[PDB]
């Protein structure tokens, strides 16, 4: 029974990633006064399938270390799917008492796939590009962890389903919209999304490729699902759980679509400029707001329950 | 401590975590709380030279609770004997 449940999560995640590539292309297209894919299947609905087949029968074009060349994509894709197993939608696949910490711990491991693939590139210049990407990723891990802790001081625990209870009456975006703003931007920078897509930017100044792409786009969906739960909590009715799933899916779709919207709207940061955005802007505010959110429940007598 | 500043000032810098029978959050007791308490109370104020000989019974009991070597050895003996008899079909275990 449990193995069926795992597959009813793994398979839809990969299908959702496939069709996000179509949605991204069509949303970007219409914001650019054009259409995007509309020939390969009606309204382009077969475009992800054609792309997927094409990439997997392409020539799989020497690695500096075979073990790490293969480890990096397995790590990326395996970790990406793992981040989904504690998500309450409304019931998690695995109900963890410390689910928020688990997601923080697993996400911190994702930078190894960047590091390992840079080592296996066998090229001095690709290793340097990987190290620049790693420095960006760990920099924005700092604010994400501190922002998350600030929010949990209103929730009371590290259990993800408690965020639902915390937002029974009101979305956490209202008491914490300054944190929501930096959290949202931090996720963009964390996933190397525009205007923080410096790996693809700086770089230009088959199956293995597809696998890394699936991992990244799964992370994009997951981060926006996490954002919906963290700040736009949906109400759970235990006798009609599908009502929660519909409302929570719509919010996650809209948050994901706003990632595309933002890509279509702005130029790119310089590397040093996105480092200053973190170390000189977000981190000072995040630290001050962390002190504020430690004090606020105490001074209002609004400390949440431990359980 | 080499310099017992804590006692001189009455400040508790690190004594609170030195033993497991001290005060704990929500009165959560350690497994060997009663054995530690007995040994500490036996040995209090007489000095380690005397306590090594005169509080040996409390300390041996406390060490048994800590590492459970004698208990595990006794269980090892009973299990080993039971396997022998079952290997010889002389013993059938109840449900």
């Amino acid at each position: 029974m449990f193995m069926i449940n795992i597959l009813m999560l793994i398979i839809p995640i990969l299908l959702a990633v496939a069709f996000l590539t179509l949605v991204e292309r069509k949303v970007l297209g219409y914001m650019q006064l054009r259409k995007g894919p509309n020939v390969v299947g009606p309204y382009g609905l077969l475009q992800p399938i054609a792309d997927a087949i094409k990439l997997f029968i392409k020539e799989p074009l020497a690695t500096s270390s075979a073990s790490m060349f293969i480890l990096a994509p397995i790590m990326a894709l395996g970790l990406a799917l793992t981040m989904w197993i504690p998500l309450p939608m409304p019931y998690p696949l695995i109900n963890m008492n410390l689910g928020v910490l688990f997601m923080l711990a697993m996400s911190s491991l994702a930078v190894y796939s960047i590091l390992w693939s840079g080592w296996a590139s066998n090229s001095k210049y690709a290793l340097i590009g990987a190290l620049r990407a790693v420095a960006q990723t760990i920099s924005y891990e700092v604010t994400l962890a501190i922002i998350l802790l600030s929010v949990l001081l209103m929730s009371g625990s590290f259990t993800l389903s408690t965020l639902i209870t915390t937002q029974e009456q009101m979305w956490l975006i209202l008491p914490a919209w300054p944190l929501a703003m930096m959290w949202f931007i931090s996720t963009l920078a964390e996933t190397n999304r525009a205007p923080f897509d410096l790996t693809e930017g700086e770089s230009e100044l088959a199956g293995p490729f597809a696998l890394f792409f699936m991992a990244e786009y799964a992370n994009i969906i997951m981060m926006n699902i996490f954002t919906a739960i963290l700040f736009l909590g949906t109400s759970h009715n235990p006798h009609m759980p599908e009502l929660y799933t519909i409302n929570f899916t719509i919010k996650s779709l809209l948050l994901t679509m706003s990632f595309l919207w933002i890509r279509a709207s702005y130029p790119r940061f310089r590397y040093d400029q996105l480092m200053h955005l973190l170390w000189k802007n977000f981190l000072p505010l995040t630290l001050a707001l962390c002190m504020w959110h430690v004090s606020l429940p105490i001074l209002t007598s609004g400390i949440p329950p431990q359980t | 401590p080499f310099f017992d500043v804590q006692k001189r000032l009455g400040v508790d810098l690190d004594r609170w975590m030195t033993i497991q029978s001290a005060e704990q959050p929500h009165k959560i007791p350690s497994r060997c709380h009663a054995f530690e308490k007995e040994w500490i109370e036996c040995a209090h104020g007489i000095g380690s030279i005397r306590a090594e000989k005169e509080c040996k019974i409390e300390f041996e009991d406390f060490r048994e609770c800590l590492l459970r070597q004698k208990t595990m050895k006794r269980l090892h003996a009973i299990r080993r004997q039971r396997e022998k008899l079952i290997k010889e079909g002389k013993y059938t275990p109840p449900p």
């Binding site: 000189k280 802007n281 000072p284 505010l285 630290l287 001050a288 707001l289 002190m291 504020w292 430690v294 004090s295 606020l296 429940p297 105490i298 001074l299 209002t300 007598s301 400390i303 329950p305 431990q306 | 929500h26 009165k27």
Partner: protein, 83 residues
Amino acid sequence: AERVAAFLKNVWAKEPVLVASFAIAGLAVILPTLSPYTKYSLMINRATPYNYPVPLRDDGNMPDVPSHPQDPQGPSLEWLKRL
């Protein structure tokens, strides 16, 4: 004072992010001591019964200790209900 206001306008124009950070951090340090509600945080935490309330052996000289949970003696949480 006027030199203080001129300094604040200068930083507000050039470094509003840092000005906001310091103002928020200052409020976090100061406001707990000025808030009338901070005292309830102590009381609510203490009123949460994590472990069992072990009963006392009745020696006949404890008029302030209830004999039954629904007897009047003992702490009341009526202040918490109205909160």
